[PDB]
Amino acid sequence: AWDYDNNVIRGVNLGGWFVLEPYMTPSLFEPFQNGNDQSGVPVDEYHWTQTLGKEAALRILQKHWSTWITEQDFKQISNLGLNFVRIPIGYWAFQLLDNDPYVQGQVQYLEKALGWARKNNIRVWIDLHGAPGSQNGFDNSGLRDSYNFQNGDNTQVTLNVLNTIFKKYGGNEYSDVVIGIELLNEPLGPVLNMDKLKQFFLDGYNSLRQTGSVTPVIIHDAFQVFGYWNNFLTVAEGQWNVVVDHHHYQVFSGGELSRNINDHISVACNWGWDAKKESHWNVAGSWSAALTDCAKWLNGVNRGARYEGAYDNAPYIGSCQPLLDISQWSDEHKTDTRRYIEAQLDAFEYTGGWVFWSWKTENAPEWSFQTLTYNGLFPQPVTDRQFPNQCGFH
Ligand SMILES: O=[N+]([O-])c1ccc(O[C@@H]2O[C@H](CO)[C@@H](O)[C@H](O)[C@H]2O)cc1
Numbered sequence: 001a002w003d004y005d006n007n008v009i010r011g012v013n014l015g016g017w018f019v020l021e022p023y024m025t026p027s028l029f030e031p032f033q034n035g036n037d038q039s040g041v042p043v044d045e046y047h048w049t050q051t052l053g054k055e056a057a058l059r060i061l062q063k064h065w066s067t068w069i070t071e072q073d074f075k076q077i078s079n080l081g082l083n084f085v086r087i088p089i090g091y092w093a094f095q096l097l098d099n100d101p102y103v104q105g106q107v108q109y110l111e112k113a114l115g116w117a118r119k120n121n122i123r124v125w126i127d128l129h130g131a132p133g134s135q136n137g138f139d140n141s142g143l144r145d146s147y148n149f150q151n152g153d154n155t156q157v158t159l160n161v162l163n164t165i166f167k168k169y170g171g172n173e174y175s176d177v178v179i180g181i182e183l184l185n186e187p188l189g190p191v192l193n194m195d196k197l198k199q200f201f202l203d204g205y206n207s208l209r210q211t212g213s214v215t216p217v218i219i220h221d222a223f224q225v226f227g228y229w230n231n232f233l234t235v236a237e238g239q240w241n242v243v244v245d246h247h248h249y250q251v252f253s254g255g256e257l258s259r260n261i262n263d264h265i266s267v268a269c270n271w272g273w274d275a276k277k278e279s280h281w282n283v284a285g286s287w288s289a290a291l292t293d294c295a296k297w298l299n300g301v302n303r304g305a306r307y308e309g310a311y312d313n314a315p316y317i318g319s320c321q322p323l324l325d326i327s328q329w330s331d332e333h334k335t336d337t338r339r340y341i342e343a344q345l346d347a348f349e350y351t352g353g354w355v356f357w358s359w360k361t362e363n364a365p366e367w368s369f370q371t372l373t374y375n376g377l378f379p380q381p382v383t384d385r386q387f388p389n390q391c392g393f394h
């Protein structure tokens with residue numbers, strides 16, 4: 001269903017759909033606020049569902065699931081010359097731990113989406129975005145500020161969920177649609193046991209193949225250096241159809257945020273040069289147009305932006321408020337954004353392709369393929385170049 005040797009992925013994530021992210025759907029979190037005090041807002045889907053309780057959470061999520069992405073989005077994704085979607089889903093869609101506050105029902109909509117993908121000749125990765133106990137302590141794992149994925153029975157539960165995913169989506173029924181199953185989104189390498197993570201990846205790989213599935217196995221790079229995974233899951237060991245998913249941003253530290261636009265572009269180009277040297281098929285499965293961390297709650301509920309010196313003892317670089325609405329952007333920022341998007345596109349198409357994060361947000365333009373396209377900052381068609389050949393790939 002996909003030729004990873006001869007095809008380039010041009011895709012978007014369907015983020016914020018099956019795993020709530022405050023910065024992507026702030027309207028679901030804002031009502032908990034008391035005036036300007038944010039201390040009472042649930043920081044993640046875990047706490048959101050827990051505070052709401054099952055009945056309300058299910059009501060509110062059913063409205064969200066049935067409206068946030070529909071078949072019209074898939075048609076538009078297709079119309080825009082995109083050929084791919086990555087679909088994040090949390091473990092809780094498939095299995096609840098004892099005492100999990102999460103509500104279920106995502107599977108219904110995942111399967112609707114696979115059909116919509118099929119109707120529109122769009123291919124899919126199914127991405128396990130959140131693991132029990134959390135693999136990274138990010139709010140987008142479902143559970144912020146803890147990472148107990150490798151503690152207790154959390155790894156085993158994760159593998160059990162993957163086996164469920166493998167059986168339902170790794171087999172013949174979806175062989176024309178699903179061109180990858182991603183074992184685990186963004187395990188936070190630096191705080192995990194990497195030997196245990198490798199064993200987990202290998203267990204996932206073996207289990208999938210053991211079902212008779214030939215679906216590509218997608219492993220996130222765990223924030224390791226380029227080439228780190230070169231010697232893992234290799235053809236030499238009879239391990240095949242493996243893709244490395246690299247994520248790329250330049251906004252999550254003061255140092256990165258301080259780069260001028262030329263330096264930002266140089267970094268993006270070098271992502272390409274480095275990816276090219278790797279020995280697995282690889283795709284930039286998340287990246288965006290963001291040159292700031294200004295989107296409300298991007299760093300989490302009740303956390304400010306490093307860009308304006310309002311988070312993690314970071315110092316002021318610039319004001320975020322003028323950057324919140326794309327209609328108020330300076331000509332310089334619009335130009336910087338288009339250059340940055342084009343440089344990243346070139347870099348990522350230099351290997352397996354790219355998957356923008358994300359298709360849509362309520363009101364965070366840096367993070368919305370739709371919004372950037374509508375404002376002429378994301379090339380349309382995606383091959384368009386206002387700033388051709390910023391990288392000089394050979
Ligand atoms: O050194 N590393 O391994 C590392 C450093 C910074 C990282 O940045 C994280 O990226 C996530 C995804 O965009 C954000 O949700 C999160 O807020 C941010 O802290 C993630 C990983």
Ligand SMILES: OC[C@H]1O[C@H](F)[C@H](O)[C@@H](O)[C@@H]1O
Pocket residue numbers: 015021140185186247286287298357
């Ligand atoms: O932080 C922006 C974006 O970064 C990564 F792509 C995460 O996997 C997403 O969940 C998140 O929304």
